Each structure stands twice: as structure tokens, then as C-alpha cells.
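Checklist before submission:
- one chain only
- standard amino acids only
- sequence pasted in full

Submission:
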Amino acid sequence: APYVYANAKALQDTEKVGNHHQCVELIQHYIRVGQASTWQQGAAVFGNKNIEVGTVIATFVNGRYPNHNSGNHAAFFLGQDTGGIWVMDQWKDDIAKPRVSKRYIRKLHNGSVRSDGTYIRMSNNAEAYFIVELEHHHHH
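Returned file contents:
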């Protein structure tokens, strides 16, 4: 929890924002999280008993946001249960996603991280989501 938008729950039904209506641009409109290429993988979201409503979360692979992967995604955490997580997000599809809105991301059967660091159906895989953190001091 280094980024927590306390009003993330209020975003339901708002107009999509940013220059391309992309998932990262929703976060960036309200919070200066920077470019996703700078993010460091934080604690896992699914199962985490400490994550606060509004925490900025994202898909992470091998410690980093996978810009190279069509399944990359970012969102605001809303809550969780035994079957998945509720997030607040957006993306460019004006038909499936006309507004900023909540959706349920499930823990999939055998959906845990694979040896190469990847996840099946990653953006729709609750286990792919980690808290967005800052690079530590031992980076160069």
C-alpha cells in the first residue's frame, strides 16, 4: 500500500479519462503513480489480509509491469472473497467498458504463476495482481 486512493469506490459510473482511455491512465489521472515501466512488484493482492480499499494494484511478471504483454492491466483494489477480487478499472473498449466501473476478477483453477513468471488469462487472473510499489534503493 504505497498508493491508496481513498475515493476509488466513488469512481463507479464516472467518465473514462486519459488520452487513450487505458487502464494505467485511469490511475494516473487521479494519482501520480508514474509510468508503469517504473513500477516494482509489491505484495500479492489475493489472500492479502492487509490491503486497503483503493490500493493501486497491477499485473506483475518477474518483478515488473509487463508492458510487452497484451494481458497487462492496472486497477484500484476494492475488496476480495474466496473466489476472487473486486477492482475499479477502465480500458479502451467503449462498448464493453463505457464507464469506469467495478468488475470481479476470479482466482482461476490452477491459475498460479508458472515457472517463466507468466499467468494464464493474466488480466482476468486474480493471482496476477500485486500492489504497485516503488523501486528500492538497491536499483541502479
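Reviewer check: The chain has one domain: 1-140.
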